[PDB]
Design a protein around this ligand. Structure first.
Ligand code: ACO
Ligand code: ACO
Ligand code: GLU
Ligand code: GLU
Lengths: 167, 169
């Protein structure tokens, strides 16, 4: 299995949404269409080569600061799991992270083994509320960035695990 | 065109240069932008390299996707010492190609540089701007149903009192 992983187009957003909706709830955070469209340039999709490039998976990398990214919304069609599509997507995202000149990537996930294959290690966060987080983000600049590591404080909504990768 | 520069995807390392370009024109000409905004939006940004000066960033531009069929051109800026040589146009050429690649159907822009954008096929349009507060209510409601009747390009607030222009791809 050699999925093609490529940058998303607006035309893939429906398939992305469908993927999210499959797992949305206590596993993945819900996303509406407008949110996805706006984020489209963060998104990569996996194609099924034998099936004419049909989209069977997705993932996103979101930039927080000059040195830090977060992987989000990685999902694979439940009928296509276990063939390396997932790992392919993550591989791509990490390369993008490198190309962008990021130094670290974090993720919030229940799939700790999956991510551990990529070198992610579980860390103990200091999560805050959404409100506190919004305060932090509003103040965020060079000075604040000196002492505040967003990877540690990013809210944990689903109650999953926090993991970190040093590029 | 004098300068046919390399136009490439932004990196986080480029953001200080981008910020410098924006701050050069910010206020009346361009909407200001802090570092955090820029970092988050980095993946929307393209930069123009000086062909001889160690690839130094001498221009920038971005495209922002609003909905399946619509995008907006933002924060296009060129080093003042390097203007009039085709860098601007090279940037916009790229953004427009990105738009097409993305499967956008239309692109808009809010600008004082009307002749510049007209070169790329943009025509002025009669906006019906709303307040920022209203625009935010609109965005919070936005979905397939609303998009049926509400064209965000007509209503996006005009902060700077410039011209509103549209391009059908
Ligand atoms: C921020 C976030 O997104 S949080 C992250 C997680 N997202 C989710 O939980 C959403 C719901 N879950 C899913 O969509 C999927 O189950 C995913 C994304 C977790 C995994 O997708 P999969 O496509 O099954 O992943 P992939 O197939 O690459 O790997 C799974 C197993 O297949 C096998 N496999 C791995 N690589 C390959 C390969 N190259 N070729 C063949 N088989 C492989 C391995 O046995 C592997 O197990 P591992 O997890 O121990 O490495
Ligand atoms: C959302 C938004 O971005 S709003 C719009 C853009 N932003 C701004 O206004 C920010 C401030 N302005 C700037 O940074 C610049 O002046 C820009 C971006 C508007 C123009 O950049 P430039 O690099 O000067 O663009 P470029 O050289 O391609 O400009 C073309 C003009 O200069 C002259 N010119 C351009 N290329 C050449 C060339 N190769 N040889 C000779 N003359 C040229 C032409 O007269 C042309 O006229 P036009 O304005 O009718 O097209
Ligand atoms: N990748 C993020 C979007 C990040 C953002 O643009 O805020 C998501 O899946 O929603
Ligand atoms: N491209 C926009 C940002 C778009 C966004 O909200 O992501 C800018 O010039 O900052």
């Amino acid at each position: 299995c050699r999925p093609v992983v490529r940058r998303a187009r607006t035309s893939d957003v429906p398939a992305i949404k469908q993927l999210v909706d499959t797992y949305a709830g206590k596993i993945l955070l819900e996303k509406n269409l407008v949110t996805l469209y706006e984020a489209v340039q963060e998104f990569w999709v996996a194609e099924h080569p034998d099936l004419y490039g049909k989209v069977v998976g997705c993932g996103a990398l979101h930039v927080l600061w000059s040195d830090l990214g977060e992987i989000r919304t990685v999902a694979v069609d439940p009928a296509m799991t276990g063939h390396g599509i997932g790992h392919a997507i993550v591989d791509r995202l990490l390369q993008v992270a490198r190309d962008l000149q990021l130094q670290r990537v974090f993720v919030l996930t229940f799939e700790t083994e999956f991510f551990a294959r990529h070198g992610f290690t579980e860390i103990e966060g200091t999560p805050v509320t959404a409100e506190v987080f919004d305060e932090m983000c509003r103040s965020y600049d060079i000075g604040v960035a000196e002492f505040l590591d967003l990877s540690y404080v990013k809210p944990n909504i689903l109650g999953n695990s926090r993991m970190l990768l040093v590029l």
